[PDB]
Amino acid sequence: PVHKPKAGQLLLKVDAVGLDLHVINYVMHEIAGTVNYKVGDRVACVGPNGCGGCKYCRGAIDNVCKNAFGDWFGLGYYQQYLLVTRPRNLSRIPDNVSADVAAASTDAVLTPYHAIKMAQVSPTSNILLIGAGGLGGNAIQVAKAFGAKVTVLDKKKEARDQAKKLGADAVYETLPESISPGSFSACFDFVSVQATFDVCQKYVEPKGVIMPVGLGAPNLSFNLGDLALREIRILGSFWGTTNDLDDVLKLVSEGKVKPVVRKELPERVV
Amino acid sequence: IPSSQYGFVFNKQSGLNLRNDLPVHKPKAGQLLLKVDAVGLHSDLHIYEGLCGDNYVMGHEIAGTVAAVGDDVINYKVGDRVACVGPNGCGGCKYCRGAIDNVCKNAFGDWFGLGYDGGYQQYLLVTRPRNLSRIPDNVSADVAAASTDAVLTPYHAIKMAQVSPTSNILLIGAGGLGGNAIQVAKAFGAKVTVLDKKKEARDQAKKLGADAVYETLPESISPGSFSACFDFVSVQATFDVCQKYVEPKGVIMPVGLGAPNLSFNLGDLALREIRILGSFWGTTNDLDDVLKLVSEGKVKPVVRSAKLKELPEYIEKLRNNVVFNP
Amino acid sequence: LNLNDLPVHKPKAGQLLLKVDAVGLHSDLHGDNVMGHEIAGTVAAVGDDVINYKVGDRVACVGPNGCGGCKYCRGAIDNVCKNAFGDWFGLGYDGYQQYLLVTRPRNLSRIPDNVSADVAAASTDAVLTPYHAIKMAQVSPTSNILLIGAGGLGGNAIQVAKAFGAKVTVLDKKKEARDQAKKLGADAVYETLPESISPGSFSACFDFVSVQATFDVCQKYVEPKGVIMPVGLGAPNLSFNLGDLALREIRILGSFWGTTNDLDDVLKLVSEGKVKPVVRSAKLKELPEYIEKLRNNVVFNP
Amino acid sequence: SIPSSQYGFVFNKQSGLNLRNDLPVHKPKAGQLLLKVDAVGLCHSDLHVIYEGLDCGDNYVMGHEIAGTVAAVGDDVINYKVGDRVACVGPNGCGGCKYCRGAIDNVCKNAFGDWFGLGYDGGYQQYLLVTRPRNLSRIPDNVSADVAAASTDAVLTPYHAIKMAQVSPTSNILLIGAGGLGGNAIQVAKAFGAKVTVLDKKKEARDQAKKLGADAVYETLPESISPGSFSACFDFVSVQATFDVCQKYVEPKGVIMPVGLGAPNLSFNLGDLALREIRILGSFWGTTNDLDDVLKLVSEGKVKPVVRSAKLKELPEYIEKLRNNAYEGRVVFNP
Numbered sequence A: 001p002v003h004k005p006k007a008g009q010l011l012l013k014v015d016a017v018g019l020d021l022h023v024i025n026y027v028m029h030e031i032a033g034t035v036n037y038k039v040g041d042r043v044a045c046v047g048p049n050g051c052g053g054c055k056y057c058r059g060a061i062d063n064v065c066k067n068a069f070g071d072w073f074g075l076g077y078y079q080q081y082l083l084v085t086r087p088r089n090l091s092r093i094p095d096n097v098s099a100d101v102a103a104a105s106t107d108a109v110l111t112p113y114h115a116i117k118m119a120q121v122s123p124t125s126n127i128l129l130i131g132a133g134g135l136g137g138n139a140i141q142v143a144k145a146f147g148a149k150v151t152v153l154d155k156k157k158e159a160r161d162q163a164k165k166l167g168a169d170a171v172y173e174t175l176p177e178s179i180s181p182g183s184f185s186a187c188f189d190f191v192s193v194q195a196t197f198d199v200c201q202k203y204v205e206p207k208g209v210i211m212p213v214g215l216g217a218p219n220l221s222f223n224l225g226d227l228a229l230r231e232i233r234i235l236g237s238f239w240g241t242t243n244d245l246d247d248v249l250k251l252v253s254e255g256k257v258k259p260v261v262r263k264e265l266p267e268r269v270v
Numbered sequence B: 001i002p003s004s005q006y007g008f009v010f011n012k013q014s015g016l017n018l019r020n021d022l023p024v025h026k027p028k029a030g031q032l033l034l035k036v037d038a039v040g041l042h043s044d045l046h047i048y049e050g051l052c053g054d055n056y057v058m059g060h061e062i063a064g065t066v067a068a069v070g071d072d073v074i075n076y077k078v079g080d081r082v083a084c085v086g087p088n089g090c091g092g093c094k095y096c097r098g099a100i101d102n103v104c105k106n107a108f109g110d111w112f113g114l115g116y117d118g119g120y121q122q123y124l125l126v127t128r129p130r131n132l133s134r135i136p137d138n139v140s141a142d143v144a145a146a147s148t149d150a151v152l153t154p155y156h157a158i159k160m161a162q163v164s165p166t167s168n169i170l171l172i173g174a175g176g177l178g179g180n181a182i183q184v185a186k187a188f189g190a191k192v193t194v195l196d197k198k199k200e201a202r203d204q205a206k207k208l209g210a211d212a213v214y215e216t217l218p219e220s221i222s223p224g225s226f227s228a229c230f231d232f233v234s235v236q237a238t239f240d241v242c243q244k245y246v247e248p249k250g251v252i253m254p255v256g257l258g259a260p261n262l263s264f265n266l267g268d269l270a271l272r273e274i275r276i277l278g279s280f281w282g283t284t285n286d287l288d289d290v291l292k293l294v295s296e297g298k299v300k301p302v303v304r305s306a307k308l309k310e311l312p313e314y315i316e317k318l319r320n321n322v323v324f325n326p
Numbered sequence C: 001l002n003l004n005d006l007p008v009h010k011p012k013a014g015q016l017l018l019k020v021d022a023v024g025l026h027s028d029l030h031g032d033n034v035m036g037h038e039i040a041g042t043v044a045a046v047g048d049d050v051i052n053y054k055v056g057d058r059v060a061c062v063g064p065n066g067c068g069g070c071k072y073c074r075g076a077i078d079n080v081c082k083n084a085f086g087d088w089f090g091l092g093y094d095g096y097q098q099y100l101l102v103t104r105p106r107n108l109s110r111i112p113d114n115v116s117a118d119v120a121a122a123s124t125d126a127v128l129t130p131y132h133a134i135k136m137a138q139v140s141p142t143s144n145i146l147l148i149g150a151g152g153l154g155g156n157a158i159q160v161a162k163a164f165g166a167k168v169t170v171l172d173k174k175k176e177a178r179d180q181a182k183k184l185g186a187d188a189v190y191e192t193l194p195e196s197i198s199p200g201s202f203s204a205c206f207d208f209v210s211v212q213a214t215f216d217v218c219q220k221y222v223e224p225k226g227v228i229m230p231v232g233l234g235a236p237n238l239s240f241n242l243g244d245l246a247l248r249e250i251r252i253l254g255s256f257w258g259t260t261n262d263l264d265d266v267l268k269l270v271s272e273g274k275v276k277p278v279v280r281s282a283k284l285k286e287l288p289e290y291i292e293k294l295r296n297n298v299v300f301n302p
Numbered sequence D: 001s002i003p004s005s006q007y008g009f010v011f012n013k014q015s016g017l018n019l020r021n022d023l024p025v026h027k028p029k030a031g032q033l034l035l036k037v038d039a040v041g042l043c044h045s046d047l048h049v050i051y052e053g054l055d056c057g058d059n060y061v062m063g064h065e066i067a068g069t070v071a072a073v074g075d076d077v078i079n080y081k082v083g084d085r086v087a088c089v090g091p092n093g094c095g096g097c098k099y100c101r102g103a104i105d106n107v108c109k110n111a112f113g114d115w116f117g118l119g120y121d122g123g124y125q126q127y128l129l130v131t132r133p134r135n136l137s138r139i140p141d142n143v144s145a146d147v148a149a150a151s152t153d154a155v156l157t158p159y160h161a162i163k164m165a166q167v168s169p170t171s172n173i174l175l176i177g178a179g180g181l182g183g184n185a186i187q188v189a190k191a192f193g194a195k196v197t198v199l200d201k202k203k204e205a206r207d208q209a210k211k212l213g214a215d216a217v218y219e220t221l222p223e224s225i226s227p228g229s230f231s232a233c234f235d236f237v238s239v240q241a242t243f244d245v246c247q248k249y250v251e252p253k254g255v256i257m258p259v260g261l262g263a264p265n266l267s268f269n270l271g272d273l274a275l276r277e278i279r280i281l282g283s284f285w286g287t288t289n290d291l292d293d294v295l296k297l298v299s300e301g302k303v304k305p306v307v308r309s310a311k312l313k314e315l316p317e318y319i320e321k322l323r324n325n326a327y328e329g330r331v332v333f334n335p
């Protein structure tokens, strides 16, 4: 029961789609396919699907578009053909990147890329990442590509092992006593419960940044005296922008990031 | 809304000519039709000097009222008052996405009234409504039109230079753009010193709020003491004053077009880490900002109105040294 | 810590001696073994190596008193120097006296000629602190800001913010603070934001109170990508809604006192008439009387 | 122990750079230290001083790329002790002005004419008196003095410029010149994640650029390279012809960094700079924090400066060689 219109629109034949739990009348957001654009172009979808006409979109921040709330690809707006209403929200897949890898890049890589870029990570950064799963594992690779030294905390042995293979410079279950408090230029929390926030706050340096990218609790608290006195910054981050997706696919193209991609959906995988 | 209208079309072979038999386009999905309320008129003269297009309605300073909208237009509705963002960016490239839709490669040759159709007509088809800015209720269409370049352009430069209330700036040339620059810079809280060779421009500069105005900087002004220098003339001599009087780590903005090339002293630029920044027109978001400043009374552009049919008479006048209502 | 035969130190090579002209007095009420952290004076003697100052220079002290040698100080962020914790002027290190030894002259700001020592002293914290926060938030003439709490700091914040060209809305529970806020140039002043103010509409929210309720207003009214600056210290911990912070990309930025360069900036604004701190003068010997008064709730010439 | 006399190379406007065997060795005062020089680099900037009248003062020991070991300290010095290995921050900032306080101690007004080996005494000698020990950076254990010396300028200068340009893993950058500075710039830029294209007029510098990790190296950019396609252009030569290539190939809103000093003046096309919003950013040397960052990159193996050593007495021979562009990479001298 398919669509087919195009006035300022295009038609995308879906080649790969990635797989929500917190969510759980629209087809359900990690999309790569084939058709500023001409038939045969390979493209990936920028989930936040910004309007393109507001101050946020114009802007460089099309991910926080107020007009598109409730109209994100597969989350307000898993199917064989997708009529793309707003072709501005597409990114060209490079020739050497497969549709499967592109699809797996549209969120699992895009999201930590956007946060790392926001934090202004550089080859002198000394960063802490908490949680090395879907997002976290890609965050390791993105961070290393920015030149950073990367320390990973994860409760799960297997995630610690994967983190070592993906290039982390140190991996631990808990930070040992020899790690000085106040020594990391940035802390990225992919878990975001209170305990994990409190470690970011203890181990972030003065003027450093805490990026609570995970969504593990509805509220978090920070110590105010400490945040003020040491000028800590907490920056929210959501998904990514169209330009960020271009950047991600370039990194993936150049071999700097290799996402791990693997419909019994009910039972990252693409 | 009518099916025909009048307007002034430019052709490389025969200049700018009245046509009273022009079509009025129906918007497609994604487009809108603007009823032109005011359209401003030196860049149109440059036309006589051989610059940008071939068979387009001129007029690049445009204010109007949305008359009809296509499908898939959700940001605007009939009756909305809007001003056009001249560079008319594509909206799909990295520059536009971006925050720098003023340097869009895909829109070169497609700017409003300078390659694509503009405001010297009654009804303008806007192919890219993203390139519109809402006119506040207390701002007239005439003043909005006069803001779309004369205020937009210096505002874009001043914002890029990151001027603040601790800035100590030098502006060279207080004419059309320079005078508006004075007002914009004061609204950012800056101290403003103005150099102009013409007595009348110096007088006007005082009236517009400059803190000091001079023909030449006196010997008591220390070299290396201004945080930013904006040069609205841009010949070598005025560049050299910017370079001598800019502070270390300060910025020179050569916003005028008085010479095709300018030289800088390299040892000085390097040692004192001087920055030279190019600036062109402005962005959509800059226009929103400008209209807010105008709305709040912080900037008051100077504008006289006339009927669009009078345009040829005023073109000759400007050529020998104003907005239009269609 | 009490009052008439204290010694006067001779500076070593890299030090200087400051003759105190004015010293300001809330935090004093709240290091071990001279207080007074809002200091203006005149250089009275310099040590052999000192090239940036000479006898007769009028200077104000930047309270955090950074070490000058660490990465934070080198840096541009001398206000968060780890080495100087416990060594701040009048809060761990020695203005409530006639002559102050400045170990570390980099932590001084030249007072402009047309600014009095009294005003300079009242600028060193009451103006410096909100200036530092406003500058960090990158306020501009297009900014639409909310300030909560219009007292000592908040009132100066109003004037600093208006100098940057911002539109300023003030919330305060106390009628008299609302009145002062109106006089100091705020564009709108309220006891509670009326229902007509749209949520998500302010580019920056500065909370000079910083209890939970006041944080929650900042979080409801800050626009996407906007900034919340919890400058007050009204609770030890505050909480934020995560989904909202992430989804709308809100930023919370800590701010502490100010830097040496910020103090140069503040004294320039004061010099140019942009900010006019409110100050009454008295003799330093009167200090104990004014301390009691503020408790049951001014600058001093030694 | 420490001798009371020593040898070194002094510059004077009247008679150029000359060996002297009767130089004093100063005893530090309270806040000072004495550095025994282990390695000192030679820079193309020494040539501008000797042969082009680039005026930095008169009558000082040259050598501005300095690594050594603390030989004695004055009474009040606690941050360093005898035996510490340190490299000098060339601009030798005052520490007390707004620029130094600041984060920009490289453009200190007070220190004009007082830079190590360029107004104040430098490293072409056995023992250097350091008046301001703030302007030192600790050499990590695994970094040799020769490499640290090369790092104080040949690496520091391009690091500072690259950082100022905000190079990232999505940057596509052009570097012109692959000698002392340019070779390091290659490695620094790769550590920031950039794609790097190099131009050099000398075959042996091109060959070295390839070995240092450049993604492309050319004499002249081929036709397949689109104008307006580089996010940043770093010119380590800075003559009009190389500036023009930066200006043709930089993207809109991109940056041109004229780090080299090959002409007294350069010109730009104004219409092009304005229309495409090109930025030209001056960059000088680097800062104390930058040097700590650089030595950490070198220590972590991300940057491996190309350096060959020689005895300080050989300096006049290597000066001639550099003047004729006769070697690649840096040469440093052991006193």
Ligand SMILES: NC(=O)c1ccc[n+]([C@@H]2O[C@H](COP(=O)([O-])OP(=O)(O)OC[C@H]3O[C@@H](n4cnc5c(N)ncnc54)[C@H](O)[C@@H]3O)[C@@H](O)[C@H]2O)c1
Residues within 6 Å of the ligand: A022, A107, A111, A130, A131, A132, A133, A134, A135, A136, A153, A154, A155, A156, A159, A190, A191, A196, A213, A214, A215, A216, A237, A238, A239, C246
């Ligand atoms: N901000 C955004 O735009 C955005 C986008 C996508 C996902 N998310 C959120 O990011 C989070 C991570 O998603 P994912 O897909 O990578 O998750 P995932 O399940 O693949 O991985 C979670 C990891 O966290 C580790 N972990 C959990 N609790 C821990 C603890 N207490 N201490 C140390 N390690 C711990 C687990 O061992 C696991 O390795 C989720 O909360 C998700 O809702 C946010």
Ligand SMILES: NC(=O)c1ccc[n+]([C@@H]2O[C@H](COP(=O)([O-])OP(=O)(O)OC[C@H]3O[C@@H](n4cnc5c(N)ncnc54)[C@H](O)[C@@H]3O)[C@@H](O)[C@H]2O)c1
Residues within 6 Å of the ligand: A228, C026, C129, C148, C149, C150, C151, C152, C153, C154, C171, C172, C173, C174, C177, C208, C209, C211, C214, C231, C232, C233, C234, C255, C256, C257
């Ligand atoms: N960030 C720093 O570096 C720094 C420096 C100095 C002081 N401070 C802190 O800033 C805060 C204020 O200091 P001050 O000198 O301005 O205090 P103040 O007593 O002079 O002013 C406080 C004002 O807040 C108002 N207020 C209190 N609670 C309120 C609420 N719930 N809602 C609305 N208004 C309320 C009061 O009516 C009064 O007008 C203090 O917590 C102080 O410790 C911070």
Ligand SMILES: NC(=O)c1ccc[n+]([C@@H]2O[C@H](COP(=O)([O-])OP(=O)(O)OC[C@H]3O[C@@H](n4cnc5c(N)ncnc54)[C@H](O)[C@@H]3O)[C@@H](O)[C@H]2O)c1
Residues within 6 Å of the ligand: B270, D043, D044, D045, D048, D153, D157, D176, D177, D178, D179, D180, D181, D182, D199, D200, D201, D202, D205, D236, D237, D239, D242, D259, D260, D261, D262, D283, D284, D285, D286, D322, D325, D329
């Ligand atoms: N801005 C600063 O702070 C600063 C600091 C140090 C050096 N410099 C300047 O940087 C420049 C480079 O110094 P260096 O020590 O690396 O020089 P070097 O002599 O070690 O190397 C110069 C390189 O440039 C190449 N080259 C020369 N002319 C060329 C041209 N026209 N086109 C392409 N390639 C060319 C040569 O083949 C050689 O490989 C010098 O001018 C020096 O004065 C500037």
Ligand SMILES: [Zn+2]
Residues within 6 Å of the ligand: A050, A051, A052, A053, A054, A055, A056, A057, A062, A065, A066, A067, A068
């Ligand atoms: Zn939008």
Ligand SMILES: [Zn+2]
Residues within 6 Å of the ligand: A019, A029, A030, A107, A108
């Ligand atoms: Zn997903």
Ligand SMILES: [Zn+2]
Residues within 6 Å of the ligand: B089, B090, B091, B092, B093, B094, B095, B096, B101, B104, B105, B106, B107
């Ligand atoms: Zn575009």
Ligand SMILES: [Zn+2]
Residues within 6 Å of the ligand: B041, B042, B043, B060, B061, B149, B150
């Ligand atoms: Zn115009």
Ligand SMILES: [Zn+2]
Residues within 6 Å of the ligand: C066, C067, C068, C069, C070, C071, C072, C073, C078, C081, C082, C083, C084
């Ligand atoms: Zn410090």
Ligand SMILES: [Zn+2]
Residues within 6 Å of the ligand: C025, C026, C027, C037, C038, C125, C126
């Ligand atoms: Zn105080």
Ligand SMILES: [Zn+2]
Residues within 6 Å of the ligand: D041, D042, D043, D044, D045, D046, D064, D065, D153, D154
């Ligand atoms: Zn050198």
Ligand SMILES: [Zn+2]
Residues within 6 Å of the ligand: D043, D044, D045, D046, D064, D153
């Ligand atoms: Zn050098």
Ligand SMILES: [Zn+2]
Residues within 6 Å of the ligand: D093, D094, D095, D096, D097, D098, D099, D100, D105, D108, D109, D110, D111
């Ligand atoms: Zn200095």
